[PDB]
Design a protein around this ligand. Structure first.
Ligand SMILES: Nc1ncnc2c1ncn2[C@@H]1O[C@H](COP(=O)(O)OP(=O)(O)OP(=O)(O)O)[C@@H](O)[C@H]1O
Ligand SMILES: [Mg+2]
Lengths: 376, 172, 99
């Protein structure tokens, strides 16, 4: 508000309140409506003033939208296995302390390992310890499919979002599932993203599978002249799995080839989903894994996998060159079921190769003319 | 940027007088280094705000936006001069801003009224807004009032920073 | 006062020839061996869709109406040595390897 003209021109109520202020020992400085019209409020602090005087979106609204996105991305991620009203956790405190240490010594860290091993759950445990004090944001590698990097930030730009954090020394961005960047036909927006973050001195973390690791290391050494920190996460050892079994109260499988599978935390999580009465419902476990991991929804995947397994068993060879359809082996390599090396392709887990040969025998039994032709 | 009063009248057609007053308030605060503003009463008489003091000289200001040549408006100026000293007895100088242009006779008459009052008048006619103090130094303020499409000057910043990002990768 | 040659060639093979596609590596190895086996300068290999055209746009492979050829002699030497390594891994006996 403003006072009305009756300082020599002041109206009676103002000089009454000013008198009581002085008699209490106090001077009052009056900042009426003409203050908010001044260059200090309007020109120097325009980003703050625009929140309150405008109905359009503002920089506070942008930071809110990105925090919501981070909370949504990490909602599905599981950090333990729950079984017979009890929760089972692998201890990761050593890895977590190594990550805290690397972020102090170095600007960029790469966290790496095979699929299902727990790379994202570690990031979830870092986030829950820091979300209040420090800026911390997570982006999926799928998001950079854009014509411009400014499409991610609304009517503001990347440089606006970066400038909103210029007074903070510790500040983190995570790029998650970095090996999916190989799917992009245009890589230019991502390169501009990294250039702005390197100039403004953010700390950056990547999660990746092993096939894209050398490309990341080359790019940081050749272009930005930084040597990044590297960390590796692994499957369980046999002694560790024995102690998990003893302490948490479940029996391990008798089949050697299944025991090798459940050393990976994702598959241990599936094993304890089909367990009751101190045994597992093996048929349901087998059906779920075949239909959801190997076939998905394509006949061509199932045909390719069956032919590959039988060719290995027929030729007596670890590495083979299958006669598949023109893109299926690359899809199975990205899924981590099939492996590749310069000598050829191979199958990663033994249990799947046994299951493939049994299905192949079933098909040859369905299609046979007589028993002797079947055995031939 | 260049001064264009058709752009101004198209942009501020719902209230020309009120927006011209704000343009002058910002330029006055820049000229006399009062970045946090000045006290003002509701329906304040004579001059637009309370006066400032500088080197034992006491200064105020007034602004008028007109369609007529100033010679048609003499009675406003005489009224301004007389109504100011009634309210603020020690006042020494008034600075006057307008979009018009006038030496001619009427200026001598109004100067005499000020002179007998003991008050100096400084005139900021249309040629003031041609000055590099407005156009070149205070460019960010001037761009608000004279440009139809002020957001175009953000695009010319975006492409420039894009160009700096592209060439950072290149090694010589 | 010397280069670390094995690291130099490893970075160059992975960055220039393989990139990130297994099909490119299998294509280039086949192309080099067919020239060395038939004695021909120009060949027409059996490959997946678009791989040879992609290698031509990289400049690694060259094309005329008689067929395809390899641009740099140094890369053809590296390809032949790698093909020998593969056959050594996959052998049943030595006589098969030399055949
Ligand atoms: N500390 C832990 N204790 C027990 N189980 C765990 C632990 N951390 C992760 N898991 C299990 O491992 C599963 C896979 O974890 P996560 O999603 O982090 O894998 P990842 O390595 O990021 O995989 P991807 O490469 O597929 O993205 C979780 O769904 C959970 O069941
Ligand atoms: Mg993950």
């Amino acid at each position: 508000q403003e006072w009305g003209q009756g300082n020599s021109n002041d109206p009676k109520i103002k000089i009454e309140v000013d008198q009581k202020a002085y008699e209490s020992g106090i001077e009052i400085v009056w900042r009426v409506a003409s203050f908010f019209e001044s260059p200090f409020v309007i020109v120097e602090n325009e980003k703050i003033a625009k929140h309150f005087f405008s109905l359009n979106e503002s920089i506070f609204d942008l930071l809110e939208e990105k925090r919501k996105h981070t909370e949504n991305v990490l909602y599905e991620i599981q950090t333990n296995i729950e079984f017979k009203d009890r929760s089972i956790e692998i201890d990761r405190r050593h890895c977590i302390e190594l990550l805290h240490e690397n972020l102090v010594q170095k600007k960029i860290v790469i966290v790496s390992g095979e699929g299902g091993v727990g790379k994202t759950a570690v990031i979830k445990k870092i986030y829950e310890a820091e979300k209040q004090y420090t800026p911390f944001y997570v982006f999926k590698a799928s998001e950079f499919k854009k014509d411009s990097i400014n499409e991610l930030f609304g009517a503001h730009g990347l440089d606006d979002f970066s400038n909103a954090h210029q007074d903070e020394l510790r500040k983190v961005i995570v790029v998650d599932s970095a090996e999916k960047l190989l799917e992009l036909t245009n890589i230019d927006p991502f390169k501009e993203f990294l250039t702005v973050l390197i100039k403004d001195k953010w700390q950056v973390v990547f999660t990746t599978r092993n096939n894209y690791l050398a490309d990341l290391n080359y790019a940081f050494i050749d272009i930005y002249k930084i040597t990044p920190g590297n960390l590796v996460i692994k499957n369980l050892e046999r002694g560790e799995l024995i102690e998990l079994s003893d302490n948490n109260g479940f029996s391990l499988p008798q089949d050697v080839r299944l025991l090798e599978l459940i050393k990976n935390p994702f598959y241990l999580s599936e094993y304890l989903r089909f367990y009751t009465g101190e045994s597992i419902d093996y048929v349901s476990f087998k059906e779920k894994l075949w239909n959801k991991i190997i076939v998905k929804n394509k006949p061509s995947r199932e045909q390719c996998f069956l032919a590959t397994a039988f060719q290995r068993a027929s030729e007596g060879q670890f590495f083979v060159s299958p006669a598949c359809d023109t893109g299926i082996l690359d899809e199975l390599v990205k899924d981590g079921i099939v492996g590749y090396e310069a000598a050829g392709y191979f199958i990663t887990h033994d249990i799947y190769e046994e299951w493939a040969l049994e299905k192949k025998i079933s098909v040859d039994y369905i299609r046979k003319a007589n028993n002797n032709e079947f055995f031939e | 940027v260049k001064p264009n009063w058709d752009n101004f009248k198209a942009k501020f057609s719902e209230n020309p007088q009120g927006n011209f007053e704000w343009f002058c308030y910002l330029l006055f605060c820049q000229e006399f280094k009062m970045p946090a503003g000045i006290f003002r009463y509701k329906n304040q008489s004579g001059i637009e705000t309370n006066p400032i003091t500088k080197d034992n000289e006491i200064i105020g200001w007034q602004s008028k936006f007109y369609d007529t040549k100033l010679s048609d408006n003499k009675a406003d100026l005489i009224e301004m001069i007389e109504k100011s000293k009634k309210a603020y007895p020690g006042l020494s100088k008034i600075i006057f801003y307008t979009n018009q242009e006038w030496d001619p006779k009427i200026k001598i008459e109004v100067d005499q009224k000020a002179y007998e009052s003991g008050i100096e008048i400084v005139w900021r006619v249309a040629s003031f807004f041609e000055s590099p103090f407005v156009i070149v130094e205070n460019e960010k303020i001037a761009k608000h009032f004279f440009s139809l499409n002020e957001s175009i000057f953000d695009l010319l910043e975006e492409k420039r920073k894009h160009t700096e990002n592209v060439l950072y990768e290149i090694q010589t």
